[PDB]
Amino acid sequence: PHGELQYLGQIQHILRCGVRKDDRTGTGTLSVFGMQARYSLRDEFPLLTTKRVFWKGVLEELLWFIKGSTNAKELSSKGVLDSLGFSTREEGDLGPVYGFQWRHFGAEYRDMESDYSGQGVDQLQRVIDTIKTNPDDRRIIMCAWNPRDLPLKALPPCHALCQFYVVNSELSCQLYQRSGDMGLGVPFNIASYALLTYMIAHITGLKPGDFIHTLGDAHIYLNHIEPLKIQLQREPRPFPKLRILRKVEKIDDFKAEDFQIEGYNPHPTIKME
Numbered sequence: 001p002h003g004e005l006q007y008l009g010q011i012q013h014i015l016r017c018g019v020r021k022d023d024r025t026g027t028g029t030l031s032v033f034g035m036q037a038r039y040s041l042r043d044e045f046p047l048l049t050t051k052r053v054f055w056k057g058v059l060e061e062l063l064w065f066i067k068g069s070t071n072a073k074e075l076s077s078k079g080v081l082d083s084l085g086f087s088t089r090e091e092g093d094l095g096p097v098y099g100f101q102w103r104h105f106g107a108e109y110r111d112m113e114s115d116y117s118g119q120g121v122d123q124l125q126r127v128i129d130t131i132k133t134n135p136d137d138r139r140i141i142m143c144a145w146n147p148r149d150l151p152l153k154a155l156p157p158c159h160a161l162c163q164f165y166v167v168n169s170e171l172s173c174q175l176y177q178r179s180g181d182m183g184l185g186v187p188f189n190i191a192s193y194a195l196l197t198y199m200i201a202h203i204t205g206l207k208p209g210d211f212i213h214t215l216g217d218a219h220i221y222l223n224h225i226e227p228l229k230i231q232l233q234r235e236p237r238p239f240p241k242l243r244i245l246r247k248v249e250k251i252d253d254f255k256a257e258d259f260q261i262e263g264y265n266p267h268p269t270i271k272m273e
């Protein structure tokens with residue numbers, strides 16, 4: 001099994017061998033623990049072809065993440081149980097969450113218009129600096145948290161860990177996710193981290209190599225079985241290409257207009273609740 005065929009084989013396997021297991025809502029999944037798939041990034045981009053993936057959402061959310069924004073409305077205006085706060089909730093201030101962890105891990109939070117330069121650990125500049133100072137390093141690792149777990153005195157575990165790897169001038173990425181929603185989150189996360197990989201490879205003078213996606217609880221929501229059953233009958237088409245339009249030097253300088261997908265012909269959108 002290779003390409004999108006891995007993803008399809010993994011859906012089939014969960015359908016055939018998954019065990020019924022409830023998530024935090026109380027809603028039902030078929031679940032399997034432990035899976036991995038590899039998608040080559042050489043001269044192709046793993047935007048799934050067996051349903052249309054919301055590519056623009058993938059990009060804009062990655063750009064907001066990279067900025068380390070905690071302003072909800074900065075993503076709402078692109079058009080794309082975590083209670084706390086009052087006037088800050090109306091305002092749209094999310095708290096020290098998402099990209100705030102990639103660019104300012106463990107900094108003291110003020111508000112979302114506040115100035116965080118040089119505060120907390122910039123995990124993402126660290127990854128890029130290490131790639132340039134020691135490409136052989138085995139610790140080129142960046143982590144994300146779910147906003148829900150972030151008391152964060154609690155030393156809460158990460159939701160995802162992304163490990164980069166460099167050999168022969170090629171940048172590879174392994175994403176480990178402690179849980180993965182195969183119907184909706186996984187196709188999105190594949191595109192998203194393969195995009196990150198293209199960005200980092202570009203500003204570091206490497207060629208993208210491989211994206212490896214590894215899960216803990218790989219699951220399918222009960223209300224995602226029939227549409228997935230039908231997706232399984234569709235034959236994958238050659239992956240599109242991702243072209244970067246100008247020469248970019250810093251991860252912060254990338255803009256949505258720098259990117260162009262080419263030769264993308266997916267099967268039609270599947271809607272999933």
Ligand SMILES: O=c1c(O)cccc2cc(O)c(O)c(O)c12
Nearest residue numbers: 106151152153154155156157158
């Ligand atoms: O606070 C941490 C945390 O809240 C969660 C997870 C991992 C950590 C890993 C570290 O190496 C570290 O120095 C930390 O300070 C943390």
